[PDB]
């Protein structure tokens, strides 16, 4: 369920191959921001969820840097997959940027990502 | 180089990491709190070309909390960035989700921040 | 435009009232949760916002105690609002739990609600 | 009552602030960083009545980043809490919003962590 294309309300591209062992790997094309291009993502999800009604939680890591740029920051997703007529990945993220001692208090923005397959 | 090697934050986890030329890091980790025991995988990435003045390198990894021992049916991702030096650093700021039902959904992700030492190898 | 009844999509009841000043004064009710009946809320909000199309930045604080319950924890809200046919106010919250030196870790729940007034 | 005081962070700022025994937090702001200067309004909430045990005291405020003398268009929220005995503690997590068009929203919010400490009074 959890392989497959996805994309969020941004208009970014995820496509993902998930591991019989938890493990996540695929490549990342974001819509906005300083990127180009798709960059290689890793990450981890829960291979045997609960058997009441609960969501897969998985998530994953992107560094900005690929052959054309280097944002010189990484971003992690840590959310959850809900499978059913509607699959959907309900997400959080953390976005840091490398940085200054300086100007460490403001590195990391933090927002929210849905991706559907739509 | 530098991120490579055994780190230990402020809780008295363990971290285990090798960074890959690639920009890929892979390792384990330990959890000295949570429900948790033993070693469980981990995945990430960083900045393979940072900036060469005194900015820190940015990265991030992920753990799925299941093991051959535990499932706690959640994940932690850790966003931040290495300082290099004599005193090597790693602060980061984490997301940990939780496998919920739609109704319990709002209160699926904690949110904190990790500092690592590491450890003269 | 900011001041009104607002409604997340957890059904939750947000009532504020912005004073000229860049105030803000009403009260919460949570659909879910340890809570039961309104709670006071008190904020700010930029009572002079820039002149392109930016939205207003504003925040506001709910300790979930009343005359009905105490649950011994704290949320704030931080986002924007955004005026127009139909007007809506964009945030992230941080829910902070009153706990022992040895909890401190697992205190903070991260979320993000987006307020309309349908 | 602990609670009540003036506190500093990790950055230098200056944190001044009233509880009122209606849960009420009222003072000014003084941040050491950023687009910022003088004194800023604060308003925040906080558990009057907390657990008798070795519990902290939930609480949070709010700061719109405006004054008579800037104006950011920004505002941040601590959530967090207090921490009593000897050295008395204000541990938080903050989100500082700005103002954007509806293009430039997903990168409109900061995340980051302030420790406070309280000054004899
Ligand atoms: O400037 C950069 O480094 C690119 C940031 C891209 C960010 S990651 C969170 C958000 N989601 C997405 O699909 N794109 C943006
Ligand atoms: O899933 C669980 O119950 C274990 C959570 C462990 C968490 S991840 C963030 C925090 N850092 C750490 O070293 N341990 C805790
Ligand atoms: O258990 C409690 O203290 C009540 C928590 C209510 C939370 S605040 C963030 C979320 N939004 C909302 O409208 N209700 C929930
Ligand atoms: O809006 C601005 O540009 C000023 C931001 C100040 C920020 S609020 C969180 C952080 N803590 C602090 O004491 N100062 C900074």
Redesign the interface.
């Known amino acids: 369920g959890i392989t497959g294309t996805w994309y969020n309300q941004?208009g970014s591209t995820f496509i993902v191959t998930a591991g019989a062992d938890?493990?996540?790997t695929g490549t990342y094309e974001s819509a906005?921001?300083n990127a180009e291009s798709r960059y290689?993502?890793?990450?981890?999800?829960?291979?045997?969820?609960?058997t009441?009604?609960?969501?897969?939680?998985?998530?994953?890591?992107?560094?900005?840097?690929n052959n054309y740029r280097?944002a010189?920051?990484?971003?992690?997703?840590?959310?959850?997959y809900?499978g059913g007529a509607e699959a959907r990945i309900?997400?959080?993220?953390?976005?840091?940027?490398?940085?200054?001692?300086a100007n460490?208090?403001?590195?990391?923005?933090?927002?929210?990502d849905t991706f559907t397959k739509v």
Chains 1, 3 share one sequence.
């Open positions: 941004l938890g493990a996540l906005v921001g290689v993502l890793t990450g981890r999800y829960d291979s045997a969820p609960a009441d009604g609960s969501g897969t939680a998985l998530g994953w890591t992107v560094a900005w840097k280097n010189h920051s990484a971003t992690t997703w840590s959310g959850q809900v309900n997400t959080q993220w953390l976005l840091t940027s490398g940085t200054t001692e460490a208090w403001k590195s990391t923005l933090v927002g929210h």
